Every structure is written in structure tokens, then in C-alpha cells.
Design a binder for this molecule. Structure first.
Ligand SMILES: CC(=N)N1CCC(Oc2ccc([C@@H](Cc3ccc4ccc(C(=N)N)cc4c3)C(=O)O)cc2)CC1
Ligand SMILES: [Ca+2]
Length: 223
């Protein structure tokens, strides 16, 4: 997260860290046994780490659970990043409490202007690389489809939305991928892509979760 702030230990209880010997992607806990992330985060040997703040020190409240199966959306396209969504089933159900809780799926899509909270352990620099120990947060509004498509001509599908600041300086970045975009207590987006990080006129692009509610529910029910 570039230009964000330190969230505060366990203040984003649904935030998950995907680990394979190091943090590589974020995710959101949607129930005691399922996590939603980005399809581009797919990898074998994924350990889901819940209740994390400092990802390098064991501070208490952490729950490490192996992924039993990762389900990449069947229509995911690695070049366009259309349908960039993946469901991860935990080997065992997480112990939900004050510091580890699930986030609700939306019943309707969010409109332009809606303020949302984006979080992650991704790169904190626009030019260069600097990964944080603790979780970073950023409040950003959903942009209009017009501005989104003007920024990324021919690359925005109906399953994507832009969020952020056109003036640059505040944005999600590499490492934040798969993480949550929560608006009014509902998970509306998943960190997907963008051109660089926190660049002028190049806001972040996110997977539009409201378009996948039926798919998520049907898939979870059959697995
Ligand atoms: C051809 C096309 N339709 N496109 C262009 C490529 C685009 O996908 C991608 C895929 C990867 C990349 C980056 C890596 C990267 C990864 C995660 C990111 C997460 C967030 C942000 C952001 N600025 N919000 C930027 C990121 C940049 C990189 O430079 O390797 C950039 C665009 C999909 C859309
Ligand atoms: Ca740690």
C-alpha cells in the first residue's frame, strides 16, 4: 500500500496473508473455511495465515492453516486478468473470534464515489521496493466507469472497477494482490492490477466481486 497508514493490530480481522515461505498475496476470509483471493495468486503449497499483524514475528492470535484446495475461476484469462478471482478452502475451519472474523459478500454493486478500505502487506513505494512488517491501510473511493476506461482504454471489462486517486501518491501495489476492498462492511473488490503504483492518472484496478456472488455461493455449496 503506497501512501497509506498503519492499520493497527487486528483491526482488519478478515485480512489473510497467503504464505509459501514468505508473504506473496493477500486474501479475505468469507466464512470459517473459505478465503477469496485473486486468481493470479494461484500457487501450490499455500499456507493461509489468519490473525496477522507483523508478518515476521509470532505475536499471538495467528492461525496457520494449510489450503486443502484452490479453485481458480474457470474463465480466468491470464493476459487480460478478466475473472481474476480464486476461492481457497482451508484444511480445517478457522477459529473465529474478535481478531479473526469473516467479511460479508455484497448483495448489490457499489456506486462511484463510495469510500472503501483497502489493506495489505504489499510494496509501500512508487519508485523502488519497500515491504512493511505490519499491515497497511488506505481509504479510497470507487471511480466512475468513464474515468476508469479513460485511464485504461480497452482494458477494463465489466468485471473490473477502478478505485483510488488520479493525482497519484496513494494506491495498492504488488504484494497487495488478492487483498480486500471493503465498502460499507461488504467485500466489493479484490486487488488485481494497475500500471505501476500510485502513478498520476493510473488508479488501481479491482475485480468486481458483486458480479461473482452467485458463482461463489454455488461453488462453495458443491465443495
Ligand atoms: C493487456 C491488458 N488488457 N492488460 C495489461 C496488463 C494487465 O495486467 C497486469 C499484470 C501485472 C502487472 C505488473 C505487476 C503488478 C501486480 C499487482 C498490482 C496490484 C495493484 C497495482 C495498483 N497500481 N493498484 C499494481 C500491480 C502491478 C507488472 O508490471 O508486471 C501489470 C498489469 C491486465 C490488463
Ligand atoms: Ca509474524
Amino acid at each position: 500500500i503506497v501512501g497509506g497508514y498503519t492499520c493497527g493490530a487486528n483491526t482488519v480481522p478478515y485480512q489473510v496473508s497467503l504464505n509459501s515461505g514468505y508473504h506473496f498475496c493477500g486474501g479475505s476470509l468469507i466464512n470459517s473455511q473459505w478465503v477469496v483471493s485473486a486468481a493470479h495468486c494461484y500457487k501450490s503449497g499455500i499456507q493461509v495465515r489468519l490473525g496477522e499483524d507483523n508478518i515476521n514475528v509470532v505475536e499471538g492470535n495467528e492461525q496457520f492453516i494449510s489450503a486443502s484446495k484452490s479453485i481458480v475461476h474457470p474463465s480466468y484469462n491470464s493476459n487480460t486478468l478478466n475473472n481474476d478471482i480464486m476461492l481457497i478452502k482451508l484444511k480445517s475451519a478457522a477459529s473465529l473470534n474478535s481478531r479473526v472474523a469473516s467479511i460479508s459478500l455484497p448483495t448489490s454493486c457499489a456506486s462511484a464515489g463510495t469510500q472503501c478500505l483497502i489493506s495489505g502487506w504489499g510494496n509501500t513505494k512508487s519508485s523502488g521496493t519497500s515491504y512493511p512488517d505490519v499491515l497497511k491501510c488506505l481509504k479510497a473511493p470507487i471511480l466512475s466507469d468513464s474515468s476508469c476506461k479513460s485511464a485504461y482504454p480497452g482494458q477494463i471489462t465489466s468485471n473490473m472497477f477502478c478505485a483510488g486517486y488520479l493525482e497519484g501518491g496513494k494506491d495498492s501495489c504488488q504484494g497487495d494482490s488478492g487483498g480486500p476492498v471493503v465498502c460499507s462492511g461488504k467485500l466489493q473488490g479484490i486487488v488485481s492490477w494497475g500500471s505501476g503504483c500510485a502513478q498520476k492518472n493510473k488508479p488501481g484496478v479491482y475485480t468486481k466481486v458483486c458480479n461473482y456472488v452467485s458463482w461463489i455461493k454455488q461453488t462453495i455449496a458443491s465443495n
